[PDB]
Amino acid sequence: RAIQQLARNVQAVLDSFERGTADQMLRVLMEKAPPLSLLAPFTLYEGRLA
Amino acid sequence: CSTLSLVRFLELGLSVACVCTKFPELSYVAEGTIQFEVQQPMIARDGPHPADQPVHNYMIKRLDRRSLNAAFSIAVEALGLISGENLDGTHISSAMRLRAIQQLARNVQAVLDSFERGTADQMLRVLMEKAPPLSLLAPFTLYEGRLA
Amino acid sequence: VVVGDRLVFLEALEKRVYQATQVPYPLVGNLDVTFVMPLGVFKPAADRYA
């Protein structure tokens, strides 16, 4: 039972390193995306902000 | 003369709700239970947040206790006719014995069939207790893992 | 799914991941606004009318 517990435990901790990446992707993509409402006009006056 | 319509709980559509099994020893068991084990998954954390541990939790539920019952009384004025003590050897008495036997049979026919409708009713009775109203359920699942 | 002229994925990651774990979902944003209201201003004599 002790070995069984250790196995079922390491199986969970190893799985954590997949959902971890799947979460880190969203966590880093969210900081890079400016809101659309503040962007759609900004793409209409490009090259004119001089 | 009317007839009677039989209903069988295993031909209803409701039977797919519950698992039914015979237990000819139920009359002896004390407070019986079942056991549960669930392991929740866990996702890694970054930087500021602390590292989380995998979690186990065991939990046990308990049995309920109920019954069903009917009554099937018969009249003495024909009870005597059944056994044969008050039966005399005539032609006008066997004609009453046959009537008494037919009455008893038609009565046990109804009482034995009562226990199928009984279960078909008990299932709804139990189900109408656990179910929480949907109005108080849909807005409850949307804040899960957060009401700390 | 096809939108416009592009052919893009479409995903929900609440059930496959993030399900039954004490970490919140990171797309539930938090908008911020700031309200202001005058308290006891008194309008001039010209614009006081029924």
Resolution (angstroms) equals: 4.4
- For C29, the token pair is 């944003």
- For B58, the token pair is 């065991």
| Helices and strands, counts by H and E, chain B | 3, 2
Q: What are phi and psi of A34, to 5 degrees?
A: -75, 155
Long-range Cβ pairs for the range B66-73 (8 Å, 24+): B66/B122, B68/B115, B68/B118, B68/B119, B68/B122, B70/B111, B70/B114, B70/B115, B72/B107, B72/B108, B72/B111
Distances (CA, A) of C26 to A8, A28, A38, C30, C33: 29, 10, 21, 10, 20
Give dist(CA A30, CA C26) in Å, integer: 8
Residue B137's identity, in one-letter code, is L
Rounded Cα–Cα distance for residues A31 and A28 (Å): 6
**Cα B117 from Cα B94, distance rounded (Å):** 36
Interface test with C, best of B38, B39, B40 (most C CBs within 10 A): B40
Q: Residue B60: CB partners within 8 Å, gap ≥ 6?
A: B33, B34, B35, B36
CB atoms within 10 A of CB C18: 20
Name the structure determination technique.
cryo-EM
Helix (H, G, I), strand (E, B) or coil at B66: coil
CA-based nearest distance B40→chain A, Å: 9
- Between B42, B46, B54, which is nearest A24 by CB? B46
Q: How many CA atoms lie within 13 A of B19 on its CB side?
A: 1
Q: List phi, psi (to 5°) of B39.
A: -115, 125
In terms of CA atoms, which chain A residue is nearest residue C23?
A23
Is the sign of the CA dihedral C17, C23, C24, C30 positive or negative? Answer: negative
